[PDB]
Design a protein around this ligand. Sequence first.
Ligand code: LMT
Ligand code: LMT
Ligand code: LMT
Ligand code: LMT
Ligand code: D12
Ligand code: D12
Ligand code: D10
Ligand code: D10
Ligand code: HEX
Ligand code: HEX
Lengths: 48, 1034
Amino acid sequence: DGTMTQEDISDYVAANMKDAISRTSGVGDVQLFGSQYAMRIWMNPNEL
Amino acid sequence: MPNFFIDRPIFAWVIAIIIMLAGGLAILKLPVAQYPTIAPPAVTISASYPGADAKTVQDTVTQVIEQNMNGIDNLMYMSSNSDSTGTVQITLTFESGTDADIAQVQVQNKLQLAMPLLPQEVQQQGVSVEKSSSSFLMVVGVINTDGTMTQEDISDYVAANMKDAISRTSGVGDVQLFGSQYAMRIWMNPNELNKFQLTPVDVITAIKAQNAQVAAGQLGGTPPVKGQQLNASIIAQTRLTSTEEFGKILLKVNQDGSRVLLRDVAKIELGGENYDIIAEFNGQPASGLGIKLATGANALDTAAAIRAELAKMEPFFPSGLKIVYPYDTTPFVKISIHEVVKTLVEAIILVFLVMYLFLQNFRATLIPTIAVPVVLLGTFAVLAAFGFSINTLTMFGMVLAIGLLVDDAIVVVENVERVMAEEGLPPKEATRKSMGQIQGALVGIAMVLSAVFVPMAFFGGSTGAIYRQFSITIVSAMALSVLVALILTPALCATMLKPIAKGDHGEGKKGFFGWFNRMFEKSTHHYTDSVGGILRSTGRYLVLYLIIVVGMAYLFVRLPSSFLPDEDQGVFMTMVQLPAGATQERTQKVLNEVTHYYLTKEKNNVESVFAVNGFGFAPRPQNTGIAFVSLKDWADRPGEENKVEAITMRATRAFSQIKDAMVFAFNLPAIVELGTATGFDFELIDQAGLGHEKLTQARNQLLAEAAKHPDMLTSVRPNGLEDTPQFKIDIDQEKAQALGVSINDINTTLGAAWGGSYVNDFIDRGRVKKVYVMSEAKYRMLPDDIGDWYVRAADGQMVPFSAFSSSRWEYGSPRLERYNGLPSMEILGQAAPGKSTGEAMELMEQLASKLPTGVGYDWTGMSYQERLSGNQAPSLYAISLIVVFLCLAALYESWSIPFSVMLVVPLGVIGALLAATFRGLTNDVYFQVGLLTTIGLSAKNAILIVEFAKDLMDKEGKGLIEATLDAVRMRLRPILMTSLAFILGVMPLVISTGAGSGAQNAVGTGVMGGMVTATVLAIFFVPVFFVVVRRRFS
Ligand SMILES: CCCCCCCCCCCCO[C@@H]1O[C@H](CO)[C@@H](O[C@H]2O[C@H](CO)[C@@H](O)[C@H](O)[C@H]2O)[C@H](O)[C@H]1O
Ligand SMILES: CCCCCCCCCCCCO[C@@H]1O[C@H](CO)[C@@H](O[C@H]2O[C@H](CO)[C@@H](O)[C@H](O)[C@H]2O)[C@H](O)[C@H]1O
Ligand SMILES: CCCCCCCCCCCCO[C@@H]1O[C@H](CO)[C@@H](O[C@H]2O[C@H](CO)[C@@H](O)[C@H](O)[C@H]2O)[C@H](O)[C@H]1O
Ligand SMILES: CCCCCCCCCCCCO[C@@H]1O[C@H](CO)[C@@H](O[C@H]2O[C@H](CO)[C@@H](O)[C@H](O)[C@H]2O)[C@H](O)[C@H]1O
Ligand SMILES: CCCCCCCCCCCC
Ligand SMILES: CCCCCCCCCCCC
Ligand SMILES: CCCCCCCCCC
Ligand SMILES: CCCCCCCCCC
Ligand SMILES: CCCCCC
Ligand SMILES: CCCCCC
């Protein structure tokens, strides 16, 4: 329905899906094809 | 083999003695337990954040560890609590049969990745990983009978001298101190700190600087100069050892040269690390050790190892200090097992007497009496080989086995006596002849009977291991019984039996035996004359048999079904739960009332009460208490009203009157890790980051809807705590920046004063212990005390907290729960009378679907195994029924004749159901295994009746009726000999009182009831079955 980007989907998988899958019976290592959200502080050196 | 050992009786004896030798050695070495290990391994991660609220703990520790718990094999689920006591506990529960060592290693491997991310205060408190039961194996209480040591003194001694050695003992998974080890307590005064222009930061800095252990090297240390003669260690600062030394710590030298010592700004005493846990023993000041059994470790061996370690310590105790034993779960195991061992001996003695009534000579009576213990002892050696333990179920396997063992021996002995009486052959000839005509059937019967007991060794999960104990014990005994019946029993029959003349049935004897022999010989004629008349009617007994089968069916569905009875184990516990925010003083007030009740209203039943303030199943300061109750011996508590169930019922009823307190006494179950018969364990999940407040509303919505269905659901309540008022304080960053006050100084001053701060270690009488700084009680009691604490700015001005802070009252969780890494709220409850747990759960699912968006659920603990698998009974007993038929078909070389034997099953079931029904017992494990035993003997009796009849028809060429009448006539004596011996042998169990009588009563009742109907009905019905079946099929 085009309401979530690559980044939104990646965060949701990382925050609500990955951990439960990683603890599922018979599951070894789990690789996320994306990144969970962090609070990004993008600094401007001129303003600093 | 018989013919070999008839000529070599000393060989036969040697084999029997070696079997008993192996059994005796097995008994001395075999592990002893109440039940086999069926509880899933649980690894618990415990962490502590001093002075932290529930949310701080969760969001800096719990969530960080939980997110690192991955790549962990055989994990069923993960649950965690984050308390406002500054504590988190994450329990990872693993699949049954998981290696607890690897489970711990894997959890520990993942924890070490999370460790560097955890706060430094949490790391320094220690983050333990343990593999133990949730419940206590025992409590080791310590008191001072001379009253020379306070609760605090005893707690410190136990911590410093006893706890460590007990913690390192093999089998001890966890040790809980009921009290605190001493720490150097620096009780800070804010008025004095402000006077000398100092803060908790200055105090902490001064302690770290002046309570230091300095590595200073050596004089003439390597590499040295040429010609060095002196070499000595340089000793600089060492740890302080006393309040005096901490007291004279120099904080600052004033401008006029005067000194500010730590004792000038703080009270310095040797006090506890915490002041949360306070224990009493029968009202007296006490400490102790709450010991938990390591996963899979033997309870009795661990208990013995603990007592051995305590025995080492006692000689070096101070005057008056004494060990008391207020709670132990092991004595009952020891005594209950020993009560079953006693009924084995009693059963063998009663077997001997019933044998002497029929054989009427001492030597002959010993042949069946020797066979039983030889096989039973042998069975212990087979359990040892297969890695089984001596437990309640394996021990009751031995008791039920006796019936099958004596029958094997009696069948052999009686048949020799019958041959000797009919022909007049000497013992040695009659033995050879007798063995020749039954040795085939004995081997064949054991394979038919194995098809009855083997199937229930293939039950799955929790129930599986329970039934597997009986299967292997009984099947092993039967196998040895046949091997003993082919080696020893024949050898003894040839050497020990007295020659009987042809036609002599002991009717010529004078005395009791003279009369009994003539009574039985007449009774045998009355019997055959009765059967002879029954065989003419036939049809009216087929219809009477259908009445017994329908009678059985009705009783089976009416009889309530359970699993394992609740045993009185001479101990129980009482929970004291006040609402969160309730003080330590309020909880002691309620604990006193509970202690008072047991010491006054239950003098005759209760021996000791060990009450702990600020403890439940784990530490929980102020609002929680627990009481460990030890009862007097079962012998001194006669009747039902003096047993644990009635005592805890009366206690719970009395304590219901207590205001602002959930106080109840509870008997800890059979399998503690099964829970209760019709209880459910429900988890409400936050699936969409809704938050605590929204999840509470969803929980309240579910509890309100569950309250409208008392027809289905009963006592549906939260397992956690309710939100409580909390003092929200806001540090104004701009104002703190403006006054030149650092946020690190603010946070340290607030945390250290109001929460306490673990600075460093010191040496108290040779032992490393903690140094804590904190506010003196009186300056951290009132909200207005906040403003009495001053922080020094960069310019040197002392600034009160009131200058740079604002505060308000708000509500928040004292205990935040998470399930499988998501915020959760555990909801307990049970099915209403007459309703199954499945229906109760099915409705809870229905109600849970109606909750707001983002609220899911899950089942945990007792409700987890419930839903995954339940009731596979018809499947295994259908195969059993088929395989028994096939085995009988092979034995008789007939597809039809097996039915004549299989139609006896209901004759023993009706009597068991009647017995259990009319004693108010339930269709449980002990009833089921006792019923399979009853079916075994009754079927075995029928097999030998049908075998003797078919033999006379095939070999001697007799008619159907004549042969059937000859069969039952010949098989009467041995059937009754066995029936009486076993029925009378299980008498001690039926009338049993004392430790484990619940299990004994349950076993004996079903067997005695089943045996009497099976005995009286079979002797009249088996001859009908054979005659009727033989006629329908040519
Ligand atoms: C047919 C030829 C093969 C023959 C087989 C010979 C080997 C079998 C015997 C060796 C196994 C028995 O091993 C033995 O076990 C018994 C218990 O059962 C122990 O017996 C002893 O234990 C402790 C000492 O540890 C004593 O205080 C105690 O009085 C005694 O019961 C012995 O300490 C142990 O050495
Ligand atoms: C005749 C039919 C057979 C009847 C059933 C056989 C008896 C079954 C007993 C079950 C309980 C046995 O439990 C077992 O007892 C023996 C002693 O007897 C103990 O063995 C003991 O040996 C010696 C005996 O003096 C002690 O010094 C020692 O402390 C201890 O090791 C085992 O540590 C215990 O596990
Ligand atoms: C997965 C493994 C598969 C194998 C399963 C095998 C299970 C079947 C076991 C059934 C038990 C049969 O038991 C066996 O019956 C035969 C019947 O001929 C008896 O055999 C006896 O029967 C009569 C005697 O009048 C004679 O025909 C025969 O010469 C004699 O040996 C054996 O003495 C008995 O031991
Ligand atoms: C609800 C279940 C009740 C369980 C009862 C189980 C059986 C009870 C013990 C067996 C007693 C039966 O008693 C026995 O009955 C048969 C048939 O009626 C009698 O048989 C008698 O009557 C029949 C027909 O009337 C004649 O063909 C026969 O010649 C004559 O002897 C026996 O003389 C008697 O000894
Ligand atoms: C430990 C059991 C000892 C049993 C001794 C039996 C004696 C049998 C005597 C045989 C003489 C031929
Ligand atoms: C857990 C699945 C059941 C496995 C247990 C099988 C036990 C074998 C019985 C041996 C019969 C003598
Ligand atoms: C201590 C572990 C269990 C020991 C096995 C039993 C030995 C049997 C000796 C015949
Ligand atoms: C599974 C048992 C099969 C029974 C065989 C039927 C025999 C019929 C022979 C006429
Ligand atoms: C066989 C041990 C128990 C002793 C009698 C109470
Ligand atoms: C475990 C289901 C009930 C058992 C009936 C014998």
